[PDB]
């Protein structure tokens, strides 16, 4: 029930998880499109304006591998804090906030398990 491949995106290493679900037809193409979407944010990740920014970005482009390839999403609060804490640097570098990152679109993380859950790693 799993088909997890190692995460090869350079900005999504050294996370609590190290694999992601990749549909066969999209492999390689997915990482190309992901690298393109993440590249404007490389200064945010490198200068470390927010603890929440890299987890948020990698949740969208290298999400944790789930049984049956189920979709997961980061919580709205994570998006909101990553945005506010990195907004000064993003404006200094003219980095637009994409439509698919608008924080109001993300879940409140208040749905009954398993809709919202905690994953433990220790």
């Amino acid at each position, epitope marked *: 029930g799993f088909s997890c491949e190692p995460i090869t995106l350079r900005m999504c290493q050294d996370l609590p998880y190290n694999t992601t679900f990749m549909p066969n037809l999209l492999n390689h193409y997915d990482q190309q499109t992901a690298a393109l979407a993440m590249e404007p944010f*490389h*200064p945010m990740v*490198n*200068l*470390d*304006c*927010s*603890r929440d920014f890299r987890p948020f970005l990698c949740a969208l482009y290298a999400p944790i591998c789930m049984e049956y390839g189920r979709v997961t999403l980061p919580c709205r609060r994570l998006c909101q804090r990553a945005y506010s*804490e990195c907004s*000064k*640097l993003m*404006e*200094m*570098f*003219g980095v637009p906030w994409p439509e698919d990152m608008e924080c109001s679109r993300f879940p409140d993380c208040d749905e009954p398990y398993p809709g919202t859950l905690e994953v433990l790693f220790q």
Partner: nanobody
Amino acid sequence: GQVQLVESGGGLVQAGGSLRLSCAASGSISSINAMGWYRQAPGKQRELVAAITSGGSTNYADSVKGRFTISRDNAKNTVYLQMNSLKPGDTAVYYCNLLYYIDYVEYDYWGQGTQVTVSS
């Protein structure tokens, strides 16, 4: 020591001329940082001109694209603004900025400003 920004290179040129601003950062700073140039004409709002990370990523205001070039020397923590094809509308005080984070705490320093004046 404590962080200090020293600016130099301003002055007066005729339209079409060129100038080079430099901003030297001293003190205990992070080697991963951003340095920028901002400008403010009297009675107007401060506006971004150009910025550059220690990694080399750059951003330019549209009004200066193709005319100004930002660059840095990481060895000496210095940022430069090469200003070509100057226009009277570039007249302003230009400020250097230094922005970095240590354990997600923001450090944001400003230079004293240096005057650029472009005559008709």
